[PDB]
Design a protein around this ligand. Structure first.
Ligand code: GTP
Ligand code: GTP
Ligand code: USI
Ligand code: CA
Ligand code: CA
Ligand code: CL
Ligand code: MG
Ligand code: MG
Lengths: 61, 423, 440
């Protein structure tokens, strides 16, 4: 009976951990995807501010 | 509860957008004043998708009207259904863009974009559960092309987890004399390859060939071309606007149609094209002559396809005929995506047609269109023609090279999956 | 005592639950308002039907069920439909945006926001039970919610209710009604994730149900209402042992002992008869022998596969209605002498039989004829692996090109979960092959 309790508890333990593991890795992965998406768009805005600044130097000619 | 926010930018964008709202307003029973005068409650079950319900049982399009020239803003305001749009949702500049992508994307459009995002933001906050955005615009001009892609990038910034789709009118010499359209189109595609989930390629070359050859209309006008566009856009949006037994939202439809993120450029199709039996409609809707993109589907392979039928017909016969076309044309469907053809049926047909069919195809033959644009592009870029218009706004010339290479990459990617095999 | 909690997940689960509980109410004489005039024990009792229904002091009989979906349109039809009064509002749970046929959204992105609420509402039902037996989970393989959220729920139920039993009713995708290219992906992902958490799963192939409706009911193009009403009959026959009692009634658990030799081999094949239209049924009453023979015609199976080209590990017959053992034993004898029924060498060839005397009921205005006797056969045959094989093949075709995989990766999943799940299916297909080999 002690063994039976031991197995039921371990099955619950392994399940609780593996689930928590999966849904921490998934949170990390989705955040890393959107973080890269925004950083790409923010890098676009730099090139946009640079294009505006390059027009401003030649109109001073 | 699944609201869509509509945006129309530029000359072309605002006209085909008006046609869209005219057609679906009639289908939903909405008059130019916003009052419902319908016979069936099915018109209203999904009215919220495109309309806000205001005080007084008035329905107001969830649309914003944008342009860098004020001319079109009055034209829209005076046409049929002019006063039903929210007046403060009209956003204007003074100068214009003169068919220059740089002006719409970097200088003049950037000046006005923030005020546009303000009206977008206030419309979205009043949505019970926003599903995404749709944009109507051309790629050959300056405002719809340049500023349209800029607006998409800014919306993708604030709403990165919402679907962004576009109805993009592709330029053609057969309809426009302006010469720098290949530049604007290539620059627009470079943005659309990255920042859209679905792009319906409405090709003016195909619309002309249809109006001239099939419809027998010598000297076609923009009104003739857009009448085809409104019929297509109405058919494409029928899946969301009417309560079929399809419980699909923009994301679910994109998930079923886009096997790879960059290959989201669709060939629209419509049938019949005249001014009919289910087998004839199905055979016509898969014909190259009925496609809104100047491409032959028999020159490529289908990654995914969606057929929408409208009218009262035998659902058994539709299933049999759809299976017939697949069986008899199995060579033109990739074998590594099983059951890649979807079918929807709406009991409600469009105005003045007992039966119609709308076709949405993700075919590798779309490369023919991009190759055409790439050819016109390189013909000039290797000659450095008219570059002063763009470098005068701050652009470097490799930015043209990057966009060109990205489109040639897109074409080659379509070719890779066209040549791919299962075993 | 020995209560069962039904959980209906996603569109398929909810709509099938609608048909099942509608049928239960008719079989037990429960009205749409929850009143049951024949129950004289007000507000409680230990009757057999109390395993699926609780009682209120006002005399209402409330299903021990929870309906869950990540979008509200389907459960909204329940909240305003004929049986709205049956369920307490807290039993109907809805999100606002669905899983868009994406397992990741149902398991991770969107499921994450509502899982705790669901478990708390399920806990409120369990606390009302004196001797809870287990759970009945209804869901589809193809839907993003039916696959992803169900997996999350099953994982969380194993934690909150240890090894308390959990049974599945799973909708296997069929192209005739499956409107989603990615349903093979979701199917393998969810089968892999729930395998360790399910004690017994009854798979229903929509193509099989589709053909049965077309062939035996002469419905040119069946609808989900046609399919579900038929599915309810199979579900009712399986659960009739728990809701009714008698001297020949065998508990489903006793059948389950025979049907699961190995924990992984817990997918019984269900066959049902008779499915007959009222036009045919007139002046043609079927005998015990006739319906029993139908149980071995593959055209009546819930899953398309060939038992003739596999081996049996168990054969259970659940009769309901006007049936007595004598006629059953006679029919079984004739069938044994005429049909291809080969058992594995390591299990006995006998047939376990149970009988319910309460006759079958049909929904008003349906297509099924009311019959005096019916039977559902539950068999553990290796042939069921054919369903895994077809599904795994479609998975391999798309995954070799990583088609549509970006939709899952975008929601936080890793390619490794795909290959991990596919490998589990490869082992499962190999396990079925192993069990069928002869000993040495
Ligand atoms: N079918 C159709 N095409 C149109 C219509 N109006 C403009 N176009 C297309 O629009 C393209 C040129 O772009 P513009 O009309 O200038 O629109 P835009 O992008 O806003 O450019 P600007 O406003 O001038 O800066 C051409 O290729 C035309 O074919 C129309 O009413 N119908
Ligand atoms: N038998 C049966 N199957 C159904 C029914 N409704 C949907 N399905 C199946 O479900 C799949 C489509 O996915 P859904 O059920 O809509 O997905 P969901 O579980 O509601 O969750 P989502 O992905 O958010 O839509 C298809 O394979 C259908 O065969 C039904 O009423 N009866
Ligand atoms: C750009 O804004 C919008 C607005 C409204 C609708 C759409 C739209 C429609 C559509 N219609 C046919 C279709 C395709 C896949 C399907 N899967 C199951 C049924 C089914 C039906 N397909 C897509 N992809 N988008 C896009
Ligand atoms: Ca013209
Ligand atoms: Ca009682
Ligand atoms: Cl998204
Ligand atoms: Mg203009
Ligand atoms: Mg759903």
């Amino acid at each position: 009976i002690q063994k039976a309790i031991e197995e039921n508890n371990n099955f619950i333990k392994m399940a609780k951990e593996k689930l928590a593991q999966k849904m921490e890795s998934n949170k990390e992965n989705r955040e890393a995807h959107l973080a890269a998406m925004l950083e790409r768009l923010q890098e676009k805005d730099k090139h946009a501010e640079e294009v505006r600044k390059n027009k401003e130097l030649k109109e001073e000619a | 509860m699944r609201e869509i926010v509509h945006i129309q930018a530029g000359q072309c964008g605002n006209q085909i957008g008006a046609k869209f709202w005219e057609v679906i307003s009639d289908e939903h029973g909405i008059d130019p004043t916003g009052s419902y005068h319908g016979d069936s409650d099915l018109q209203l079950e999904r009215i919220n998708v495109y309309y806000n319900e205001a005080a007084g049982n008035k329905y107001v399009p969830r649309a914003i009207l944008v342009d860098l020239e004020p001319g079109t803003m009055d034209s829209v305001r005076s046409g049929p259904f002019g006063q039903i749009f929210r007046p403060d949702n009209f956003v204007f500049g003074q100068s214009g863009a003169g068919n220059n992508w740089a002006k719409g994307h970097y200088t003049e459009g950037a000046e006005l974009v923030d005020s546009v995002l303000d009206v977008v933001r206030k419309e979205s906050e009043s949505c019970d559960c926003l599903q995404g955005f749709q944009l109507t615009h051309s790629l050959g001009g300056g405002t719809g092309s340049g500023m349209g892609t800029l607006l998409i990038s800014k919306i993708r910034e604030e709403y990165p987890d919402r679907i962004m789709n576009t109805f993009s009118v592709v330029p053609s010499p057969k309809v426009s004399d302006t010469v720098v359209e290949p530049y604007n189109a290539t620059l627009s595609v470079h943005q659309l390859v990255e920042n859209t989930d679905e792009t319906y390629c409405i090709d003016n070359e195909a619309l002309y060939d249809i109006c001239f050859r099939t419809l027998k209309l010598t000297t076609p006008t923009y009104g003739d071309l857009n009448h085809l566009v409104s019929a297509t856009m109405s058919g494409v949006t029928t899946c969301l606007r009417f309560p079929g037994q399809l419980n699909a939202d923009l994301r679910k439809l994109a998930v079923n149609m886009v096997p790879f993120p960059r290959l989201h450029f669709f060939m629209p199709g419509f049938a019949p094209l005249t001014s009919l039996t289910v087998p004839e409609l199905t055979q016509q809707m898969f014909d190259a002559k009925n496609m809104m993109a100047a491409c032959d589907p028999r020159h490529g392979r289908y990654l995914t396809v969606a057929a929408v039928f409208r009218g009262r017909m035998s659902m058994k016969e539709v299933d049999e005929q759809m299976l017939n076309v697949q069986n008899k044309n199995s060579s033109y469907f990739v074998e590594w995506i099983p059951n890649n053809v979807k079918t929807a049926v709406c009991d409600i047909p469009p105005r003045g047609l007992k039966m119609s069919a709308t076709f949405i195809g993700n075919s590798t033959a779309i490369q023919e269109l991009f190759k055409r644009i790439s050819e016109q592009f390189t013909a000039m870029f290797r000659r450095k023609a008219f570059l002063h218009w763009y470098t005068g706004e701050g652009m470097d010339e490799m930015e043209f090279t990057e966009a060109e290479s990205n489109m040639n990459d897109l074409v080659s990617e379509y070719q890779q999956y066209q040549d791919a095999t299962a075993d | 005592m020995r209560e069962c909690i039904s959980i209906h997940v996603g569109q398929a689960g909810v709509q099938i639950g609608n048909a099942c509980w509608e049928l239960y109410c008719l079989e037990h004489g429960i009205q749409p308002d929850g009143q049951m005039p024949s129950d004289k024990t007000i507000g409680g009792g230990d009757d057999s039907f109390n395993t699926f229904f609780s009682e209120t002091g006002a005399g209402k009989h409330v299903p021990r069920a929870v309906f869950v979906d990540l979008e509200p349109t389907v459960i909204d039809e329940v909240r305003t439909g004929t049986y709205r009064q049956l369920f307490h509002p807290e039993q109907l749970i809805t999100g606002k945006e669905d899983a868009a046929n994406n397992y990741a959204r149902g398991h991770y992105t969107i499921g994450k926001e509502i899982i705790d609420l669901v478990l708390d509402r399920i806990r409120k039902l369990a606390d009302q039970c004196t001797g809870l037996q287990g759970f009945l989970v209804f869901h589809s393989f193809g839907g993003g919610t039916g696959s992803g959220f169900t997996s999350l729920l099953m994982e969380r139920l194993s934690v909150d209710y240890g090894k308390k039993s959990k049974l599945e009713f799973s909708i296997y995708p069929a192209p005739q009604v499956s409107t989603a290219v990615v349903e093979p992906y979701n199917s393998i992902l969810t089968t892999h994730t729930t395998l360790e958490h399910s004690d017994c799963a009854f798979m229903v192939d929509n193509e099989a149900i589709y053909d049965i409706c077309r062939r035996n009911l002469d419905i040119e193009r069946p609808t989900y209402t046609n399919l579900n009403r038929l599915i309810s009959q199979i579900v009712s026959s399986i659960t009739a042992s728990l809701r009714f009692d008698g001297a020949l009634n065998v508990d489903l658990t006793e059948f389950q002992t025979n049907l699961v030799p190995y924990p992984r081999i817990h997918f019984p094949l269900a066959t049902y008869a008779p499915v007959i239209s009222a036009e045919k049924a007139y002046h043609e009453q079927l005998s015990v022998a006739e319906i029993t023979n139908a149980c071995f015609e593959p055209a009546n199976q819930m899953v398309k596969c060939d038992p003739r080209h596999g081996k049996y590990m168990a054969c259970c017959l659940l009769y309901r209605g006007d049936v007595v053992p004598k006629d059953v034993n006679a029919a079984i004898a004739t069938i044994k002498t005429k049909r291809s029924i080969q058992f594995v060498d390591w299990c006995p060839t006998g047939f376990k039989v149970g009988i319910n005397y309460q006759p079958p009921t049909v929904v008003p205005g349906g297509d099924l004829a009311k019959v005096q006797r019916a039977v559902c056969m539950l068999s553990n045959t290796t042939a069921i692996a054919e369903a895994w094989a077809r599904l795994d093949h479609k998975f391999d075709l798309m995954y070799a090109k990583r088609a549509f995989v970006h939709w899952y990766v975008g929601e936080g999943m890793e390619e490794g979960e795909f290959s991990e799940a596919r490998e589990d299916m490869a082992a499962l297909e190999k396990d079925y092959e192993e069990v069928g080999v002869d000993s040495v």
